[PDB]
């Protein structure tokens, strides 16, 4: 009964910890995504520099 | 606002009290909260009494 209530609170803290893990994973995924759009964006830029160099040459 | 589970315990065949020496049995009925403000306020009141 009392230990059961303590266990409900412990389960609550456990799902809170799971959500915290999900959130640190969200941050990891978000920085990985940001790195990836940065890579795509700068790749587009290098393509622009390259074709401009050929045109001017 | 007592809200948490009642922990009950009892000691018979006591020992004389540390600061007066009264040979008095002991019994405890606790409800202890997990908030910090309560942990300090109740600590103050309980150590006071």
From Swiss-Prot, chain A:
Domain of life: Eukaryota
Compartment(s) where it occurs, according to its Swiss-Prot or TrEMBL record: Melanosome; Cytoplasmic vesicle, Clathrin-coated vesicle membrane
A GO cellular component annotation in the UniProt record: vacuolar proton-transporting V-type ATPase complex
Primary site of residence: other
GO molecular function, one term: proton-transporting ATPase activity, rotational mechanism
Keywords, ordered alphabetically: Cytoplasmic vesicle, Hydrogen ion transport, Ion transport, Membrane, Transport
Bias type Basic and acidic residues, positions: 33-53
Coiled-coil residue windows: none
Example GO BP: synaptic vesicle lumen acidification
Function: Subunit of the V1 complex of vacuolar(H+)-ATPase (V-ATPase), a multisubunit enzyme composed of a peripheral complex (V1) that hydrolyzes ATP and a membrane integral complex (V0) that translocates protons. V-ATPase is responsible for acidifying and maintaining the pH of intracellular compartments and in some cell types, is targeted to the plasma membrane, where it is responsible for acidifying the extracellular environment.
Subunit structure: V-ATPase is a heteromultimeric enzyme made up of two complexes: the ATP-hydrolytic V1 complex and the proton translocation V0 complex. The V1 complex consists of three catalytic AB heterodimers that form a heterohexamer, three peripheral stalks each consisting of EG heterodimers, one central rotor including subunits D and F, and the regulatory subunits C and H. The proton translocation complex V0 consists of the proton transport subunit a, a ring of proteolipid subunits c9c'', rotary subunit d, subunits e and f, and the accessory subunits ATP6AP1/Ac45 and ATP6AP2/PRR.
Family under the similarity heading: Belongs to the V-ATPase G subunit family.
Designated name of the protein: V-type proton ATPase subunit G 2
Species classification: Eukaryota, Metazoa, Chordata, Craniata, Vertebrata
Curated annotation (Swiss-Prot), chain B:
Effects seen without this gene: Embryonic lethal. Knockout embryos die at 5 to 6 dpc, before gastrulation.
Protein location: Cytoplasmic vesicle, Clathrin-coated vesicle membrane; Cytoplasmic vesicle, Secretory vesicle, Synaptic vesicle membrane; Melanosome
Tissue: Predominantly expressed in neurons in the cortex and in the dentate gyrus, CA1 and CA3 regions of the hippocampus (at protein level). Expressed at lower levels in astrocytes, oligodendrocytes and microglia (at protein level). In the cerebellum, present in Purkinje and granule cells (at protein level).
Assembly with partners or alone: V-ATPase is a heteromultimeric enzyme made up of two complexes: the ATP-hydrolytic V1 complex and the proton translocation V0 complex. The V1 complex consists of three catalytic AB heterodimers that form a heterohexamer, three peripheral stalks each consisting of EG heterodimers, one central rotor including subunits D and F, and the regulatory subunits C and H. The proton translocation complex V0 consists of the proton transport subunit a, a ring of proteolipid subunits c9c'', rotary subunit d, subunits e and f, and the accessory subunits ATP6AP1/Ac45 and ATP6AP2/PRR. Interacts with SPAAR.
Function: Subunit of the V0 complex of vacuolar(H+)-ATPase (V-ATPase), a multisubunit enzyme composed of a peripheral complex (V1) that hydrolyzes ATP and a membrane integral complex (V0) that translocates protons. V-ATPase is responsible for the acidification of various organelles, such as lysosomes, endosomes, the trans-Golgi network, and secretory granules, including synaptic vesicles. In certain cell types, can be exported to the plasma membrane, where it is involved in the acidification of the extracellular environment. Required for assembly and activity of the vacuolar ATPase.
Family as reported in the entry's similarity comment: Belongs to the V-ATPase 116 kDa subunit family.
Name the UniProt record assigns to this protein: V-type proton ATPase 116 kDa subunit a 1
UniProt organism field: Mus musculus (Mouse)
Shown segment, full-protein numbering: 199 to 247 of 839
